[PDB]
Design a protein around this nucleic acid. Structure first.
Lengths: 48, 1322, 49, 541
DNA sequence: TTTTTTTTTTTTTTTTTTTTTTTT
DNA sequence: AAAAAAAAAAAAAAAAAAAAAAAAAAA
């Protein structure tokens, strides 16, 4: 975790919460199961 | 002739192999070790004497003052075991040492002293060892498992070709001392000898040699053989030795004496070397090119210029040879370097070596071990001297010296505790030889390479550590202090030694809570061998080598008893007959076989000596003389088995059982079982809770009396005699006049234990097993302990198992239990728990245990006494108030903090204790318990006095009969005046006064004992700093059987009771008796534990004979036919030992035997001698049960016959303590955590279950999103969402407001605590 | 939620950005990590422009 | 401060985290540094204090990386922010990816075969604790509770009215059963609870195969989906009746496992001459009626009139009736197979492969619900008729071969001859070793073959004639041939010799162990046969 | 005599699920 | 009486990844 977080900090990286893990950590719906459609809607409302 | 308690119920024995060595005292290890830890040794080698002589005397920093040790003593403990357990203090003895301080004078390096002073100083208290091998630390019974660590010495390990692509083996030697830094010597892929001190960075080996004052020439001379080249004015002749020519090809014509022995090109052959030897050729001629690459041995300096022509360890070349030719040197010494016999390992290592002199090597080693800071001329020298050649900081030990000398093939067996130059050089030479081809590696699992420390060795080491600490303290004090005539008491501090010894005995990987829920578990825990803890290999550091059963385990360590799971094999359990050699090695017994005769004399063989000799098998027939009946017999000589001749045999096993532990020798028909399932049985046999009425092993192994007697629980008469008073709390034994000492009139009072909690919350209880006025002899069972019956271990109950698949209720492994098992209440177990309430002294004010509690009603306080503490015997269910305690409260003005029974537990309050700090008030119940103990002690003391005083008064009466006869004038007056009568002038004149003075002394002893006990009872106990008092309560739950209560036999067949069927529904045979259990038979074949079916058959036979006895006794027929039947039952089998002819047995004793057998005759089946499958048929047919062992069962419910007759028999079943109500628990709105808002720990803390990282994939695999969303959003984490859904569900609305997990915010904050900025962009 | 802030009397290097094996400071200045740790130990001076 | 709590333990004792110790050290060092700078202390002292502050901040940020970790008064490496982030105990893997969960419980399990495929038992007490907010909601809806405190008190006292409310709630509210090692997605399945008295989570037997759950005390957790969407999820995705097909391979995961299979095997078989062989019956009903009264044994060859259906048409079932030749046992079995399947499926020995393929055929031809009911019926009837069989195992069910000792004598003679040849120098050590292992393997195979010949076909009876051979009914052969918790490998360690055993190195010992379990193993042979057991256990661990 | 590649060596990660005499 | 951090600790296998130092092998 030290390596990953240090590299992310120095690089100034930006995560967008798209996978099955970051959504799990953040507590939002899952982009795999029943939440799939919801996520698609979240994409459709955005940039519209 | 049989012992009386054995005569109560003599156990039929099927063993055909006679016993030659009775199973020794099962707790030899712990007792012997701790006895060697404390003993006055005239020549201190082991015990406190050893440590004291090692550290003392103590010399000041040239201060003309010295402190020297004199002697040591162990004062009697203030408290003893029972009150030590009840009160909670360690059962320790105070070690008190006489120390002598002496002051010297000026100008007296060894002159006489001017002043001396001796003082007895108390320094530390050591926890003594209870009679059962268990320490008592804080009211509990801790035990120190014995450790098994790699033996100190030299180990020539290999790498087995791994850790390299080439697959080359890199041999490496290691010197491991008992205390100090190690020393390794390892090779590399380039064949250079490298060293690494203390497993630190690597170095060339030769550096150490240079640090030992050895020049390059000295190194070459030590490790290489010189080859001499001569200059006979030309041709570069050379002195030849034939054997050095092996493995080489003749590049030129090898000739001498004008005879061509070998020619160019042809390889040198062994025939050629023999021909050279016969020719007696010493000097030959060789071309100069032979020296074109060879390495010079010693330095050469020109005689003219005094200049170094060439130094040692330098390959010679043609130019160098030409230069040194005219220099005037004719003799040249090179090194015999061969690729197969004498490799040039040292030469290449020296070439790699960058150091040049001793000082450079010492500087390098100092930078190595202590890098960074500059080296110094003195610092490096002192460090290296204090590394390997210092008695203070490096000690082989001696087991270490013996191993070091034996491995290197040295004559002596004792010497210095520190290495020497010769030692290191010999180690390097042996490693180089192993690399060469001669010599073999030493595996690190041969049990002649792993000691057994015990409590004694570890305790001694820790005491020595404390001793050196106090040594440093006194060293600082002395030189600092002057003579000051300061007594030797202010110099010594008792805190370091006591702290160290208590820290070891209380906190360590080894000093662990005893698993005190059986006699068997106690005895098997005390005889444990752990490969973990300080100084040993940890769990994650162990491969598969140490986890395996090396062929030297036979007879020393048990192969089939190791706790399965993460630590398997590292926790090996001792064998039955194993011992501890004087060096700590595991030696096992064997029988000496002479030319042809098997003499009964026993020799103990260590793991080393067993390899050389030849050892036979336990089951080898002999014909009344020790002569083998078979001329060929199986043996196991060098770790491998084979058929050997008759005379060639050397040793034979003492008894068949010695291959196993004591935890697996209790399994009947073990030899029929699998190894995995034998392990399961022997690991699940030491968890059986002591049932309410432990009954019997109906099929034992003949090795059950020893387990019960030798473990402390069973109790046993110290001296033979006749019972005088038996009560369920105490037993009084009148010792026989012959067994009594002349002085005292001794009567032995055994105070039993009644329902006290054991460390696993099971209830240990001792009841009497001897009626009033019954004789008892030495070492016979009086009070059966928990899970014992007439001295025989009884771990469970023997019930009528019936193998058949019943309606699926025993599908996988489940066991169907008839309700007759619970109606008869035979598996009921008493679980005693302890709850505590501590009243402290808060800053706001002291806490109180007043009965008045604010805001509570009257029913809640009803069960409390006037002092507010629950009554003894009140039936308290969940939530009740057990101790009414209140505390000061800030801006009633007090807060209720009363201890209450945890929800779920429901039992009777059998006992209450109240400990009060010295100088603190006592409450009503404390006074009641104090008065109870006081009256009990006073009554016991008076009862003890009674008979002793009565004997003296009877003697006084008898004396008064003669010389002043008073037949009727004496009895009328009170006995008090019987000691004040005159006498005539005779030898008896000074007898009345003597008896009167003796009576006065007796009364004085009585009153002082009473006063001492009163003081010990009334004294306010010692507690922690800041605690006013403690109130403990003992609940006594009684758990019955229910679906979930795990049950398991002894052959490692387990199962969860799956249903308690009514009596009728169970299968029943034509006689009406319903089978009390219905197992699943499909688990027998696959699991291959076929021992249990034979046990079941033998159990059916046993109860058949028992029921025949019961029928013959129901009608009062006679003793004669009972005699005849019991004799025909005990004479069954062939060759069976233990002729038990009942002619000697008295008629009343025969009747008592019939009474104790009517429940079923016990049968003994030794582990590996066994009852033959043909004898079981005979015993079944002795009754009337079918020989095959299977009867026809009628289905309970349908009422119609079962096809294919089915097995039934009396199997012995335990009740493992994995009870269901200890496990089952559920949570809905329990209190959450503080750091990350989440549920709390399980069960007692009311927590939920772990939806772990592996249980979130199980949902993601599905199309499950909402369920996962809630499972990690609102069920556990989101602070407001759980409340919102709580109200919604109470409102009937099924929805959520997920929000964000609080733990995510916690992580964000913790990341922001670092120098990294993290946020949530939208 | 509320946080504080401690004002060091001297600047202090961040270990994560100093001792991670691909040491960020180590290869930022192209200076060997040993010569940097030596500087942080006040064992030697370093020219600064 | 809250993230590094300083709560007072009961009794005026304070429990604190290690962040506090490090922060205190840092502030103390910073104060000393500022004081030294104020006092203009010499260069060495200020440099030392600066270095010490550097080390203190190093420890606070990430302890145990630069230098050696600084311990507290407990002589252990204290945990800093880094140790709280990373590690198996860190926030990521302990409190973010998976957390302890409310509305949950755990317990030990049992068999409970009366359950249907889609409902698991649930102890009354545990169920009451789990569904408590639901009980409160229903009570305050029904008006029996004036306030929430009254409802809580009524539930705590466990009034008799609460049980009806709980049975109303449980009706349609799936609960997720979950074993501890959930390796694959079939380790979390949602059943419908059925209230049970006691303290055991009764679990349908078949699903054990999916869980690898054996009732040797292996514990299970129940979670409760709360929201409406989660309930519908556990109803439509995770229900046990929906996972009748594994995710890794297209084979079912509801195979009748070890006792149902023995029941069917014993019940779908033929005896050459049993009671009432050779009569004609008017269908499965007549066969069952004959069997119950005992007039005809369970398996006797007879002729039965059966109607079998086929869906060869465009989704339309067509029947055909014929006088098949079968046994009364198969006639009884046929009443459970659904309409579509053909009779030939239940006209054979019906071991474990045949029964599993029967289930697969039912699933692929009919769908899902028919196969679920078929699996339930198969389980019920298999259990019942295994019970009726009374299939036991005694010490007379391991018939050691009559020619075992002859084979062992031949092997001993051969090994003696090879040893003599070695004494003559004709054979080297390795070659003789290979020859000896070869002869021992051949002898062991011969012994096993003799065993199987004397165990599987040995049963001989007569039917209007001299004699005739038949597949034997010896119980161990029934439990091995059927595939129900047995095999030809796990047998031959009971009757025939148990082959050779390997040493710790992995080598093969020259002399095998020539005693089986029916005759007991002497000391040396058993000791040899522990290397394998401990190697296996360590390998599993 | 300098420079690039390859090799070696040291160091950094991972290693299952649940259940106490001494300064302010 | 309130507070407070030094030590001499020393120790582990196995395996692999990655970075730094060292040694060939030139032109």
């Amino acid at each position: 975790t030290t390596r990953v977080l240090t590299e992310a900090a120095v690089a100034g990286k930006r995560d967008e919460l798209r996978g099955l893990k970051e959504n799990v950590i953040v507590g939002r719906l899952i982009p795999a199961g029943t939440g799939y459609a919801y996520h698609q809607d979240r994409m459709r409302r955005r940039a519209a | 002739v049989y012992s009386y308690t054995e005569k109560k119920r003599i156990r039929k024995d099927f063993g055909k192999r006679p016993q030659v060595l009775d199973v020794p005292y099962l707790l030899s290890i712990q007792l012997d070790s701790f006895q060697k830890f404390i003993e006055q040794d005239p020549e201190g080698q082991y015990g406190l004497e050893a440590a004291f002589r090692s550290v003392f005397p103590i010399q000041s920093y040239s201060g003309n003052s010295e402190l020297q040790y004199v002697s040591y003593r162990l004062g009697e403990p203030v408290f003893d075991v029972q009150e030590c357990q009840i009160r909670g203090v360690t059962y320790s003895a105070p070690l008190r040492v006489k120390l002598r301080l002496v002051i010297y004078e000026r100008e007296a390096p060894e002159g006489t002293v001017k002043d001396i002073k001796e003082q007895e100083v108390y320094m530390g208290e050591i926890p003594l060892m209870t009679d059962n091998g268990t320490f008592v630390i804080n009211g509990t019974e801790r035990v120190i498992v014995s450790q098994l660590h790699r033996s100190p010495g030299v180990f020539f390990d290999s790498d087995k070709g791994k850790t390299h692509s080439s697959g080359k083996v890199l041999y490496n030697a290691r010197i491991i001392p008992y205390r100090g830094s190690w020393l390794d010597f390892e090779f590399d892929p380039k064949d250079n000898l490298f060293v690494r001190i203390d497993r630190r960075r690597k170095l060339p080996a030769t550096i150490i040699l240079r640090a030992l004052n050895y020049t390059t020439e000295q190194i070459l001379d030590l490790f290489f053989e010189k080859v001499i080249f001569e200059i006979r004015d030309n041709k570069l002749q050379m002195e030849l030795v034939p054997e050095r020519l092996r493995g080489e090809t003749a590049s030129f014509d090898i000739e001498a004496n004008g005879k061509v022995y070998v020619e160019k090109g042809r390889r040198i052959t062994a025939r050629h070397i023999r021909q050279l030897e016969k020719d007696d050729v010493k000097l030959i001629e060789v071309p100069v090119e032979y020296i074109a690459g060879k390495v010079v041995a010693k330095d050469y300096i020109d005689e003219s210029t005094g200049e170094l022509i060439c130094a040692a360890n330098m390959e010679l070349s043609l130019d160098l040879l030409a230069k040194l030719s005219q220099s005037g040197h004719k003799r040249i010494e090179t090194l015999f370097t061969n690729d197969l016999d004498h490799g040039p390992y040292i030469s290449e290592t020296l070439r790699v070596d960058p150091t040049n002199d001793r000082l450079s090597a010492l500087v390098e080693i100092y930078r190595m071990m202590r890098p960074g800071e500059p080296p110094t001329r003195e610092a490096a020298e002192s460090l290296f001297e204090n590394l390997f050649f210092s008695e203070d900081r490096y000690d082989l030990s001696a087991v270490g010296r013996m191993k070091f000398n034996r491995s290197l093939l040295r004559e002596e067996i004792e010497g210095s505790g520190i290495l020497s130059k010769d030692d290191i050089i010999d180690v390097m030479k042996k490693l180089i030889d192993i690399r060469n081809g001669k010599g073999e590696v030493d595996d690190i699992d041969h049990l002649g390479n792993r000691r057994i420390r015990s409590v004694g060795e570890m305790a001694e080491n820790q005491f020595r550590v404390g001793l050196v600490r106090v040594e440093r303290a006194v060293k600082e004090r002395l030189s600092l202090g002057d003579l000051d005539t300061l007594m030797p008491q202010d110099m010594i501090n008792a805190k370091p030694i006591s702290a160290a010894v208590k820290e070891f005995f209380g906190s360590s990987q080894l000093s662990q809570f005893m698993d005190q829920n059986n006699p068997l578990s106690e005895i098997t825990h005390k005889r444990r061998i752990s490969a973990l803890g300080p100084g040993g290999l940890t769990r994650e550091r162990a491969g598969f080598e140490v986890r395996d059963v090396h062929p030297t385990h036979y007879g020393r360590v048990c192969p089939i008893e190791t706790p399965e799971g993460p630590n398997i094999g590292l926790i090996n359990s001792l064998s039955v007959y194993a011992q501890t050699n004087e060096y700590g090695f595991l030696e096992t017994p064997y029988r000496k076989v002479t030319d042809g005769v098997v003499t009964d004399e026993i020799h103990y063989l260590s793991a080393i000596e067993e390899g050389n000799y030849v050892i036979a098998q336990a089951n080898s027939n002999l014909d009344e003389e020790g002569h083998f009946v078979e001329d060929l017999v199986t043996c196991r000589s060098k770790g491998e088995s084979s058929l050997f001749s008759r005379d060639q045999v050397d040793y034979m096993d003492v008894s068949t059982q010695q291959v196993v532990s004591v935890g697996a020798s209790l399994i009947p028909f073990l030899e029929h079982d699998d190894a995995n399932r034998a392990l399961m049985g022997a690991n699940m046999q030491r968890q059986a809770v002591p049932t309410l009425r432990a009954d019997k092993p109906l099929v034992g192994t003949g090795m059950e009396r020893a387990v019960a007697v030798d473990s402390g629980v069973t109790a046993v008469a110290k001296r033979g005699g006749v019972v005088q008073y038996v009560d369920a709390s105490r037993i009084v034994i009148k010792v026989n006049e012959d067994e009594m000492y002349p002085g005292e009139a001794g009567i032995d009072i055994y105070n039993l234990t009644k329902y006290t909690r054991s460390n696993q919350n099971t209830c240990i209880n001792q009841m009497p097993c001897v009626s009033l006025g019954e004789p008892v002899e030495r070492g016979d069972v009086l009070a059966d302990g928990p899970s014992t019956d007439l001295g025989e271990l009884a771990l469970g109950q023997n019930m009528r198992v019936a193998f058949m698949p019943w309606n699926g209720y025993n599908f996988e492994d489940s066991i169907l239990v008839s309700e007759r098992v619970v109606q008869e209440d035979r598996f009921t177990t008493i679980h005693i728990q302890e709850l505590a309430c501590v009243s402290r002294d808060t800053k706001l004010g002291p806490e109180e245990i007043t009965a008045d509690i604010p805001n509570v009603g009257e029913a809640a306080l009803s069960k409390l006494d006037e002092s507010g503490i629950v009554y003894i015997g009140a039936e308290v269910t969940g939530g009740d108030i057990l101790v009414g305690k209140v505390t000061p409260k800030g801006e009633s003005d007090v807060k209720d903090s009363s201890l209450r029974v945890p929800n779920g537990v429901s039992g009777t309050v059998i006992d209450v204790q109240v400990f009060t700090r010295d100088g603190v008030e006592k409450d009503k119940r404390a006074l009641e318990i104090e008065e109870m103990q006081l009256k009990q002690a006073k009554k016991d003391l008076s009862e003890e006095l009674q008979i002793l005083e009565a004997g003296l008064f009877s003697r006084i009466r008898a004396v008064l009969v003669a010389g002043g006869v008073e037949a009727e004038k004496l009895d009328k007056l009170p006995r008090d005046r019987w000691l004040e009568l005159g006498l005539t002038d005779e030898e008896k004149q000074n007898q009345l006064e003597q008896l009167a003075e003796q009576y006065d002394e007796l009364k004085h002893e009585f009153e002082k004992k009473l006063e001492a006990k009163r003081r010990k009872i009334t004294q306010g106990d010692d507690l922690a700093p800041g605690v006013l008092k403690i109130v403990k309560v003992y609940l006594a739950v009684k758990r019955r059987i229910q679906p979930g209560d795990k049950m398991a036999g002894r052959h490692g067949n387990k199962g969860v009771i799956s249903k308690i069927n009514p009596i009728e529904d169970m299968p029943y045979d034509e006689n009406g008796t319903p089978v009390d259990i219905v197992l699943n038979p499909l688990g027998v074949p696959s699991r291959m534990n076929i021992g249990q079916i034979l046990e079941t058959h033998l159990g059916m036979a046993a109860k058949g004979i028992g029921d025949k006895i019961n029928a013959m006794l129901k009608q009062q027929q006679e003793v004669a036919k009972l005699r005849e039947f019991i004799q025909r039952a005990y004479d069954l089998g062939a060759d069976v030992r233990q002729k038990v002819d009942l002619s000697t047995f008295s008629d009343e004793e025969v009747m008592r035997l019939a009474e104790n057998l009517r429940k079923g005759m016990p049968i003994a089946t030794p582990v590996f001698d066994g009852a033959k499958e043909a004898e079981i048929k005979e015993l079944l047919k002795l009754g009337d049960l079918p020989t095959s062992g299977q009867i026809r069962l009628y289905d309970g419910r349908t009422g119609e016959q079962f096809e294919r007759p089915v097995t039934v028999g009396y199997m012995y079943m335990l009740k493992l303590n994995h009870l269901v109500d200890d496990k089952m628990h559920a949570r809905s709105t329990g209190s959450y955590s503080l750091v990350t808002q989440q549920p709390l720990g399980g069960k007692a803390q009311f927590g939920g279950q772990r939806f772990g990282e592996m249980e979130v994939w199980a949902l993601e695999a599905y199309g499950a999103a909402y369920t996962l969303q809630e499972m990690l959003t609102v069920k556990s984490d989101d602070v407001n969402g759980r409340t919102k859904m709580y109200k919604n569900i109470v409102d009937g609305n099924h929805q959520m407001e997920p929000g964000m997990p609080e733990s995510f915010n916690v992580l964000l904050k913790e990341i922001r605590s670092l120098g990294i900025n993290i946020e949530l962009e939208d | 939620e509320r946080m504080g802030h401690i004002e060091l009397a001297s600047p202090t290097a961040h270990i994560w950005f100093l001792k991670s094996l691909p040491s960020r400071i180590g290869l930022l200045l192209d200076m060997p990590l040993r010569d940097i740790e030596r500087v942080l130990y006040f064992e030697s001076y370093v020219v600064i422009e | 401060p809250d993230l590094r709590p300083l709560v007072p333990l009961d009794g005026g004792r304070f429990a604190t985290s290690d962040l506090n110790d490090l922060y205190r050290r840092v502030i103390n060092r910073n104060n000393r540094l500022k004081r030294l700078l104020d006092l203009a202390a010499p260069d060495i002292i200020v440099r030392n204090e600066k270095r010490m502050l550097q080390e203190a901040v190093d420890a606070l940020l990430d302890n145990g990386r630069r230098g050696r970790a600084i311990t507290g008064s407990n002589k252990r490496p204290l945990k800093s922010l880094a140790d709280m982030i990373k590690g198996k105990q860190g926030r990521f893997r302990q409190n973010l990816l998976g957390k302890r969960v409310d509305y949950s419980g755990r317990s030990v399990i049992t068999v409970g075969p009366y359950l249907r495929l889609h409902q698991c038992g649930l102890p009354k007490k545990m169920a009451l604790e789990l569904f408590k907010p639901f009980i409160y909601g229903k009570l305050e809806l029904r008006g029996l509770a004036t306030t929430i405190k009254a409802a809580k008190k009524m539930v705590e006292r466990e009034e008799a009215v609460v049980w009806d409310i709980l049975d109303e709630v449980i009706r349609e509210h799936p609960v997720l059963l979950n074993r501890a090692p959930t390796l694959h997605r079939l380790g979390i399945q949602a059943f419908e609870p059925v209230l049970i008295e006691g303290k055991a989570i009764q679990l349908h037997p078949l699903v054990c195969a999916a869980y690898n759950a054996d009732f040797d005390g292996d514990q299970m957790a129940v979670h409760v989906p709360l929201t409406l969407e989660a309930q519908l999820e556990a109803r439509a995705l995770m229900m046990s009746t929906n996972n009748i097909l594994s995710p890794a391979n297209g084979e079912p995961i509801i195979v009748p496992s070890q006792d149902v299979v023995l029941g069917l095997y014993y019940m779908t078989r033929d005896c050459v001459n049993a009671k009432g062989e050779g009569m004609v019956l008017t269908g499965p009903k007549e066969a069952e009626r004959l069997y119950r009264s005992g007039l005809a044994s369970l398996h006797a060859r007879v002729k039965v009139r059966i109607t079998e259906y086929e869906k060869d048409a465009n989704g339309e079932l067509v029947a055909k009736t014929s006088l098949k030749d079968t046994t009364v046992g198969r006639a009884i079995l046929w009443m459970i197979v659904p309409k579509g399947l053909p009779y030939s499926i239940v006209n054979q020995a019906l071991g474990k492969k045949a029964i599993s393929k029967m289930l697969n055929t039912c699933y692929r031809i009919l769908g899902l619900k028919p196969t679920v009911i078929f699996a339930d019926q198969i389980m019920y009837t298999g259990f019942a008729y295994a019970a009726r069989s009374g299939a036991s195992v005694g010490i007379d069910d391991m018939v050691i071969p009559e020619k075992k000792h002859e084979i062992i004598s031949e092997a001993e003679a051969e090994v003696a001859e090879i040893q003599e040849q070695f004494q003559s120098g004709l054979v080297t050590a390795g070659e003789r070793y290979n020859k000896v292992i070869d002869i021992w393997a051949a002898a062991n195979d011969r012994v096993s073959k003799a065993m199987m010949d004397n165990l599987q076909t040995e049963t001989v009876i007569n039917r209007d004639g001299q004699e005739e051979k038949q597949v034997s009914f010896n119980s161990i052969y029934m439990m091995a041939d059927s595939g129900a918790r047995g095999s030809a490998a796990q047998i031959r360690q009971l009757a025939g010799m148990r082959g050779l055993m390997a040493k710790p190195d992995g080598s093969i010992i020259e002399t095998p162990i020539t005693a089986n379990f029916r005759e007991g193993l002497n000391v040396l042979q058993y000791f040899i046969s522990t290397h394998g057991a401990r190697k296996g256990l360590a390998d599993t661990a």
